[PDB]
A paper describes a structure:
The dense glycan shield consisting of 22–23 N-glycosylation sequons per protomer is an essential feature of SARS-CoV-2 S architecture. The transition to the ‘up’ state exposures of RBD for the binding to hACE2 is also a prerequisite for S-mediated viral fusion, directly correlating with infectivity. Here, we dissected the role of N354-linked glycosylation, acquired by BA.2.86 sub-lineages, as a RBD conformational control element in attenuating viral infectivity.
Thus, we performed all assays under the same condition by using three representative variants (BA.2.86, BA.2.75, and XBB.1.5) with strict controls (loss and gain of N354 glycan). We observed that N354 glycosylation dramatically increased the proportion of the ‘closed’ form from 19% to 79% in BA.2.86, 50% to 75% in BA.2.75, and 45% to 90% in XBB.1.5, making the ‘closed’ form the dominant population. Notably, the N354 glycan resides in a cleft formed by the NTD and RBD from two neighboring subunits, and establishes hydrogen bonds with T167 of NTD and with E340 of RBD, respectively, acting like a ‘bolt’ to lock the S-trimer in an ‘RBD-down’ state. For this, three paired groups of six variants (BA.2.75/BA.2.75.5; XBB.1.5/XBB.1.5.44; BA.2.86/BA.2.86-T356K) were carefully selected due to the only difference being the presence of N354 glycosylation or not in their RBDs. Surface plasmon resonance (SPR) results demonstrated that RBDs with or without the N354 glycosylation showed comparable binding affinities to hACE2, indicating that the N354 glycosylation does not impact hACE2 binding. Coincidentally, the N354 glycosylation (K356T mutation) first emerged in BA.2.75.5 and then in XBB.1.5.44, but they did not display growth advantages compared to the prevalent variants, presumably due to the dramatically reduced infectivity.
Residue numbers in the entry:
A (entry chain C): 25 to 143, 155 to 297
B (entry chain C): 737 to 836, 849 to 1078
C (entry chain B): 981 to 1078
D (entry chain A): 737 to 785
E (entry chain A): 981 to 1029
F (entry chain B): 298 to 677, 689 to 736
G (entry chain C), H (entry chain A): 395 to 443
The structure:
Amino acid sequence: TQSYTNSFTRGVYYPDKVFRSSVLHSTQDLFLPFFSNVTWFHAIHVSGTNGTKRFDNPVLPFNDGVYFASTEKSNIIRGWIFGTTLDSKTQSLLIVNNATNVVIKVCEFQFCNDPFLDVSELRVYSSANNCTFEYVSQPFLMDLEGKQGNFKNLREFVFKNIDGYFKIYSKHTPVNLGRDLPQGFSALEPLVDLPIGINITRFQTLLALHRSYLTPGDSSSSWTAGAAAYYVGYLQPRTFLLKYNENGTITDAVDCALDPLS
Amino acid sequence: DCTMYICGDSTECSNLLLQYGSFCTQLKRALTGIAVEQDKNTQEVFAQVKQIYKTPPIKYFGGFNFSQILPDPSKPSKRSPIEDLLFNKVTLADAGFIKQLICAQKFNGLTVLPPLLTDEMIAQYTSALLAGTITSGWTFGAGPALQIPFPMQMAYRFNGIGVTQNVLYENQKLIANQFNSAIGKIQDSLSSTPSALGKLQDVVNHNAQALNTLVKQLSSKFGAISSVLNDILSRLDPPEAEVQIDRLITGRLQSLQTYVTQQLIRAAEIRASANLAATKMSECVLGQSKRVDFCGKGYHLMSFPQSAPHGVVFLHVTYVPAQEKNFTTA
Amino acid sequence: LSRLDPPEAEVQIDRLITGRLQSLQTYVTQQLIRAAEIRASANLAATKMSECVLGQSKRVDFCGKGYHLMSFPQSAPHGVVFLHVTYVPAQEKNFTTA
Amino acid sequence: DCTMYICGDSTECSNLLLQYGSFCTQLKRALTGIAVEQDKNTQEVFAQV
Amino acid sequence: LSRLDPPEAEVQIDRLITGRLQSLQTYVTQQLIRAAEIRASANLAATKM
Amino acid sequence: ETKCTLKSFTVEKGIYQTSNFRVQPTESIVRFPNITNLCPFHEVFNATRFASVYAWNRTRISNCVADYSVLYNFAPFFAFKCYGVSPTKLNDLCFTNVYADSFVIRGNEVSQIAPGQTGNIADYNYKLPDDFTGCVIAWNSNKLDSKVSGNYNYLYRLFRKSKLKPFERDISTEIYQAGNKPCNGVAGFNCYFPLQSYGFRPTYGVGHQPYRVVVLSFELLHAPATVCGPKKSTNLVKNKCVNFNFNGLTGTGVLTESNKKFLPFQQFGRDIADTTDAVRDPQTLEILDITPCSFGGVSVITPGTNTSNQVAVLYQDVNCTEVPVAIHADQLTPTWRVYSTGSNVFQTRAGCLIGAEYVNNSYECDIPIGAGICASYQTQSQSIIAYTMSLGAENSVAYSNNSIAIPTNFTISVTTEILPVSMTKTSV
Amino acid sequence: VYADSFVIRGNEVSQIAPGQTGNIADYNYKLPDDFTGCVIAWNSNKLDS
Amino acid sequence: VYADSFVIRGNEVSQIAPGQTGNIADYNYKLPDDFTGCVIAWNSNKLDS
Ligand SMILES: *[C@@H]1O[C@H](CO)[C@@H](O[C@@H]2O[C@H](CO)[C@@H](O)[C@H](O)[C@H]2NC(C)=O)[C@H](O)[C@H]1NC(C)=O
Ligand SMILES: *[C@@H]1O[C@H](CO)[C@@H](O[C@@H]2O[C@H](CO)[C@@H](O)[C@H](O)[C@H]2NC(C)=O)[C@H](O)[C@H]1NC(C)=O
Ligand SMILES: *[C@@H]1O[C@H](CO)[C@@H](O[C@@H]2O[C@H](CO)[C@@H](O)[C@H](O)[C@H]2NC(C)=O)[C@H](O)[C@H]1NC(C)=O
Ligand SMILES: *[C@@H]1O[C@H](CO)[C@@H](O[C@@H]2O[C@H](CO)[C@@H](O)[C@H](O)[C@H]2NC(C)=O)[C@H](O)[C@H]1NC(C)=O
Ligand SMILES: *[C@@H]1O[C@H](CO)[C@@H](O[C@@H]2O[C@H](CO)[C@@H](O)[C@H](O)[C@H]2NC(C)=O)[C@H](O)[C@H]1NC(C)=O
Ligand SMILES: *[C@@H]1O[C@H](CO)[C@@H](O)[C@H](O)[C@H]1NC(C)=O
Ligand SMILES: *[C@@H]1O[C@H](CO)[C@@H](O)[C@H](O)[C@H]1NC(C)=O
Ligand SMILES: *[C@@H]1O[C@H](CO)[C@@H](O)[C@H](O)[C@H]1NC(C)=O
Ligand SMILES: *[C@@H]1O[C@H](CO)[C@@H](O)[C@H](O)[C@H]1NC(C)=O
Ligand SMILES: *[C@@H]1O[C@H](CO)[C@@H](O)[C@H](O)[C@H]1NC(C)=O
Ligand SMILES: *[C@@H]1O[C@H](CO)[C@@H](O)[C@H](O)[C@H]1NC(C)=O
Ligand SMILES: *[C@@H]1O[C@H](CO)[C@@H](O)[C@H](O)[C@H]1NC(C)=O
């Protein structure tokens, strides 16, 4: 299913690698505007075995990056797909994680859906034809358990491809108690940066379809309500004025293009 | 200092700036003139007296209570309760007290020279002329101080504005009570008002903002690859660095020119205000002023100045005709 | 212009000319402020003439120190010098008043 | 306004000028001070009552 | 920007922009002095009133 | 120094500012990362299958000490022009990451690849951004990439729907519409193959011979630096003024173990001056605080030159218990330092004074200093004495409720008020 | 648009420029300082030998 | 007037200049930054082969 929500104030990272304290520095970049539209998405898959077929996967546009937020039990969401034109006519991205590993490729992948027959590989591409770049190492996401589901982890990702150097800004905020995107402010820091060289305007995600649960089905659309537990938001070039805490973190930042007061 | 503010400890950039001519000796002369001008402003405003007077050990002025304006020995700065209140009201930024984070940041040659008259002798000047004006009236503004009783001086001040002595000598208790109430409530007004020392606060804040903008101007590429001379001189080559550094320098020099040009105008304004304050002292403090609406509103009686951060505050004592009645005249 | 050639002489002349023009701008800007100061002093001197010279001034410590009697101005190079004649109460004696 | 007077609706020129630092916020502050100063002059001269 | 290419267009723009910015600086500097004079005259007029 | 800073052999009474004093660095410390594995540059430069321009090969460089001086024998180097980073002292820089892109182009377009260049290749096959830092190597490869029949191994695009952003690839085999006429893989008339033959012949003259080009892209933006030059790392010193060269960032100042909390991805720090305040030691991952030398202004307090030749130096806003006394040859810029800094020391809120002693007496003060202190020339037998300014003659009145003072005689006094009314009119 | 074509020696191929002085640039073909347009130069040793 | 004559490689023909750093420009022949005069360079492959 699909539903809408209000991003409130969220999606602010450190543009630069310079340490600041009690500084009101401002900077302009692909920032998620405050109080914007963030769209839920859900992959209903409880009757997949009883025929039916999922039939629930769109091609999310990527224009000027994508903001990502989700709450998975352990590893429900593993990776993403970027690129354009889908077919081997043009390249694509295959960011995907496993255990303590990440493998990403810029190879001309032709596919149709996003499964991997795991909870393995394949099912998400059929062309290792003219691959250009490969990457490995530590995964973006480190799971931490509070011994219960009340402390739902929130995994805030911001993706950018300005002249390569893929942005994987990530942070863990397990203080959530059930409310969707709770009121408050958090900073956001990168992990890895590497150019890929590709015109990206398509975006998709990977779900652990071989064993899925809690996927209600309905006809919710056009600003309706529906449980999806998976967030996507688009960035636009925005000037941001950031307050750096005396310790060095970010306490609060104000947009420069939303309200006259801002 | 142009050398440090323009080319931080870089020999080649100092050599590049030396060719610009006497373009910063003039800059130093301008700011030295501004500094000596500020010292002259303060000394001209406050040092209107040749001798420092002391208040009598007893404090009787015919019911008049000068406790809020006369200095108290209990406080360690020897300032009046209202004078100290003015100091507390003005959040001073810097005064040059061997600081060795905004002020400490300025390892860019932007130093604040402390004023010649410290705020322990400006208060002495204020107390001296207060003793003069409350024990000798205007007589100490002309020659030697002529010791006269305060009720007599007040009756003379009333005679100055066409009220005659009999009014004061028949209402002295009422006048003393009214004066004490006004002196009591002026401190409360200054304390509880949102911002009354707006002029002094703006005077401090304008200089603070000018210095902050000068500091922030140190990163403008001005058409250069970077705003750091050390990285430019580690990255480029002397000939290419020559123009690149020179371009960054001419930009920074123009930025400093803007600061000194604004400071010249601000100092001219502050000198105009200091001349106004000096005339105000000489007229209102050292005698009665027949100029209307000059020393406060209403008919003027006298004034008491109070030491204030980067300024002076007068306490104009004025006669207001209050409630009136209609009559028939011919 | 004897050493270089027009193509690069132009930009060299442009750099020299903008530097010299900014130098002249600085002089003119300082002269404007100095002339504003001199006009303030000239207005003060004109008021001083009108008040002290053309009559007695009751303003205290305006026309000299002490009670003012009259003044005589004297021409000076790029200025004026006043000779304020003032009454000073000089030596005094204590008394008893009621 | 420095942006319009200096780089008429040109994005690249606005980006070039942005690097010049706080070199026109100060310019705006000076003229805003002049404007409020003119208002204060008029009100101080006339509103004596 | 229609004729030249970014490399030399930028330096050309930089030269034009610094010239125009200094021209605006001159106007603001003169306005500051003129406003100081007008404030002196306004103070004189207020005292006169 | 005063007679020099103001061009006059005669100096009258007054306090003059001359220059500043800076503690000179003792030694230079370099902390380039402890790498030795030379990254492969020969494999990039001297290859036999240089990719075509339309599909430029991009090679990543990782932790390595790259000496940009052993590559001069790897290529003919027809042109080695470089951008903001200059190849002269390029071995003294530390890069976050270095990228080399290698391809082949024609002679007339060898200068076409550059920031903001518009044409066929620079717009449709390889576009460099305007802010691109790094530089391009170009040399003729006519002797190797020549075919008598035809060198049909290189390609380049000609037709695209729109422009191209910088630093990406448009490697694709589709059919250009070239109008409303629709085509489906036919590649017939009105629909031309975007890649067309790029054959090379040895008989071609200059401007048409193949030009194998490798362009190196740098990102020296202040960030964790890896690829670095062959600069020997020295021992680290604290609490002493040195010329640090941390990862290509030079400067001067004292370095203290800092209490900063640089996040793992943070390398350099920034105060509100846009200058580096804290740095991370790359060979130790320890955070260092950068504070400049114990500088300060110098003011010379002197009487008239025809009264004495003895002056009193007052340092601006600096306690005379640390650096003002600390002095050595080639340690402080003011070499006039023959002043003892141990005789006649007057600690003042305006910075300490050297050369004058405190006098308990207070007189009218001639040469202003600040904080209620002025120095003047006094006969002991002549020396400069700094004292507290005398506010005025102490006086007391005899206020009495019944007493009054009244003058019995007067004194007529005439004063002078010197008021300028005009300045020298001039015209330029 | 005006195209002028001729042949010159190698050492003087850069001599044809605004404000250049020498033999050809002063006696045979002089370009004005304010000249807008540009010069195309290529070797023709294979044909003109 | 002083003339200095030597021979160098092609990739380093532009290396001799005020403030250039490398092998020859730093170890064999360095020209000062304030150097006035100019350098003449031509290929001598036909003779020095
Ligand atoms: C995560 O998945 C990747 C494939 O998506 C796998 O990568 C293998 O890593 C091991 C590590 O030594 C190699 O020996 C294999 O050859 C890799 N396989 C492939 C297909 O490349 C592996 O399952 C995980 N990655 C790891 C463990 O690094
Ligand atoms: C993508 O991979 C395919 C795999 O076959 C390549 O297809 C052939 O590659 C050979 C290379 O020697 C060419 O001679 C053929 O013309 C290709 N056949 C086609 C394109 O139908 C293909 O070349 C690869 N593409 C790229 C850009 O490398
Ligand atoms: C490229 O690398 C090869 C090594 O694969 C080297 O080839 C040498 O070239 C020189 C010059 O002709 C010969 O004298 C050597 O005998 C060659 N060695 C080998 C092992 O082939 C050299 O570094 C480079 N060659 C070219 C032609 O650029
Ligand atoms: C593009 O160009 C290089 C150099 O021609 C190609 O060569 C290989 O690059 C990889 C690195 O990815 C090396 O490990 C190999 O040793 C190189 N040679 C061979 C024969 O594989 C490579 O295809 C591209 N390099 C990239 C993408 O980095
Ligand atoms: C990425 O590739 C897609 C391919 O569809 C481009 O989309 C086309 O762009 C051209 C040029 O603007 C136009 O014909 C249309 O906007 C798109 N065509 C179709 C058929 O949809 C897209 O522009 C490319 N991205 C970038 C940044 O160039
Ligand atoms: C979000 O989108 C829905 C429909 O797409 C619209 O009704 C709603 O007003 C939007 N809200 C915001 C804050 O943009
Ligand atoms: C900030 O720093 C102080 C002292 O270093 C510490 O007590 C406090 O916990 C810090 N706050 C954080 C880390 O949020
Ligand atoms: C300067 O010396 C005084 C007197 O010892 C001391 O109190 C003050 O702290 C010193 N300054 C600094 C910055 O420590
Ligand atoms: C080398 O540097 C690394 C950090 O990158 C660390 O192991 C240590 O500081 C150094 N080790 C040795 C053996 O020099
Ligand atoms: C300097 O002073 C000496 C003695 O005090 C005197 O003879 C001489 O004329 C003076 N010179 C000047 C230029 O004042
Ligand atoms: C100054 O006063 C105090 C004690 O009265 C002390 O510093 C010193 O003894 C005095 N010095 C002189 C020269 O009297
Ligand atoms: C004035 O009267 C008060 C109150 O009696 C007394 O304390 C004071 O000493 C008197 N002053 C003189 C000197 O007459």
